[PDB]
Design a protein around this nucleic acid. Structure first.
Ligand SMILES: C[S@@+](CC[C@H](N)C(=O)[O-])C[C@H]1O[C@@H](n2cnc3c(N)ncnc32)[C@H](O)[C@@H]1O
Ligand SMILES: Nc1ncnc2c1ncn2[C@@H]1O[C@H](CSCC[C@H](N)C(=O)O)[C@@H](O)[C@H]1O
Lengths: 260, 259
RNA sequence: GUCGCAUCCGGGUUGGGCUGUUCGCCCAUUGCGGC
């Protein structure tokens, strides 16, 4: 089926998926970009509709594997895309079902706990860093939706394969207690420099919201509160930069380095 | 005195500052956000006009220091702002003009050399990381605009006091040579892990745009270092890379040993 | 600020928030111009 008019009803339906409410109502979501579509397919997500733009290449069509295939003009593509410059390959996938029930951790896991994050770019960047550092688990507690377009783009598709689970704040606390994982709260006023923590054992790093930071209750639960030094005018670092810094310090230590 | 119409001639001139062309012509630029205005002031920049919206606080007016204060309606504010939901505190500052010529670094400086043209939002975030880690100097391409709205917003205002200088490549190479600063190229294919470099005596990190480094710079570097990537992702965001590198140097200057 | 015109029930065509701001972002809800 070929579609030209940006006013085609399917195009309005497709463009609607950029909204979290439509994703919840339909159970489906949009994945934009060849790499991102590849990663969703490779992660086992169920493709319902492949969207091909005018400058798509022959191999793109072979990705559909039985899903409906729609050709879109540059005009209709522009409406469906979340990007100033539209990608040429997109996929409508069924939202995945994932629960922490099936998750088992090894002896010394590296875990990230994200509490209240609001900016989808920050979440995507954290997921990219978690991929780089080999994080064993990412718990997203009450933040922006994991399948927001910018999470997919900023994660370069890593959101689909990463062990990342949206959880309620209370379930995060429960799961952390159940797993007996030591909690390390990252907070700018933390009493200990982050380099001075030992992360060779199992560890869960707690990161707070971009505006208000970690709730006092969560800082209290942690065994230790760590800080990343601020030597200039900024009072705080970006949440994703902080997560990366913590993950790589732990990786440094797990790669042979000694705590400070 | 209150300015209520978006069509007021003064609103027209203030909104024109959204264009770099106009900022260069007038020598003025807009800083949106109490936090950012505060940081511009504390950085020593010259406030020419303070813009106050209907919800500004009494203390906001006292920031003016003899600048003209304009009270703007929400409708006039929306025309000047770069945001769907504007700030109540905006400031028209004089564009600072800084040259590298004066700069003298100490014995063990922490320097970041950004090669290529980076997008504004990424640049802003790179400069915040640099501010956080206490970079002694940041060198960017000659045509880099450091007073765009995204650089101010994504830097959390850190760009105003940060020693960042848009310079020609030869000027950059020359400055680094004349300080005898070890150059460390960050590249995914680096021969060494970034933790293995020794940054206790001074370092100039070379980082390309989110892009790649030019080959001449990679070869000239004393060491090419990589950040380990244990999954499918082949690269990290440039701002994250910048932070990882700068905080590693800080780690080593804080008693840490190279891996 | 204000004035048409739509549209919806005369009365509405919204509130808020934001340490990544850009075809900005988030959250409750329930339009298009002119001067
Ligand atoms: C998003 S990366 C793009 C990669 C870039 N084209 C290259 O090959 O260097 C942008 C910048 O981040 C740096 N970078 C990103 N990930 C890195 C890693 N794992 N190791 C070293 N440098 C990295 C590179 O120096 C690069 O200039
Ligand atoms: N310098 C730093 N040290 C440790 N954690 C930091 C940090 N900068 C940012 N973070 C992390 O990023 C999150 C958002 S920063 C929140 C800022 C708030 N003014 C505050 O002071 O808490 C924080 O909750 C923390 O998890």
């Amino acid at each position: 089926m070929r579609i030209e008019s940006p006013q085609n009803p399917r195009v309005k339906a497709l463009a609607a998926l950029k909204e979290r409410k439509e994703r919840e109502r339909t159970g489906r979501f949009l994945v934009e970009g060849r790499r991102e579509v590849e990663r969703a397919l490779e992660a086992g997500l169920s493709l319902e509709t492949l969207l091909l733009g005018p400058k798509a290449r022959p191999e793109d069509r072979a990705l559909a594997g039985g899903a409906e295939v729609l050709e879109l003009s540059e005009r209709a593509l522009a409406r469906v895309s979340a990007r100033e410059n539209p990608a040429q390959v997109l996929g409508v996938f069924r939202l995945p079902r994932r629960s922490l029930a099936g998750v088992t951790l090894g002896a010394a896991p590296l875990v990230l706990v994200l509490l209240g994050l609001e900016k989808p770019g920050n979440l995507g960047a954290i997921l990219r860093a978690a991929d780089g550092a080999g994080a064993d688990l990412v718990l997203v507690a009450e933040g922006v939706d994991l399948f927001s377009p910018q999470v997919i783009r900023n994660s370069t598709g890593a959101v689909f394969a990463l062990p990342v689970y949206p959880v309620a704040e209370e379930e995060a606390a429960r799961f952390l207690e159940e797993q007996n994982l030591p909690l390390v709260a990252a907070t700018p006023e933390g009493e200990r420099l982050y380099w001075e923590g030992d992360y060779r054992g199992g560890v869960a790093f707690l990161l707070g919201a971009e505006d208000k930071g970690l709730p006092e209750a969560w800082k209290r639960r942690a065994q230790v509160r760590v800080r990343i030094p601020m030597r200039g005018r900024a009072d705080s670092l970006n949440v994703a930069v902080t997560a990366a810094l913590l993950l790589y310090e732990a990786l440094r230590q797990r790669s042979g380095g000694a705590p400070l």
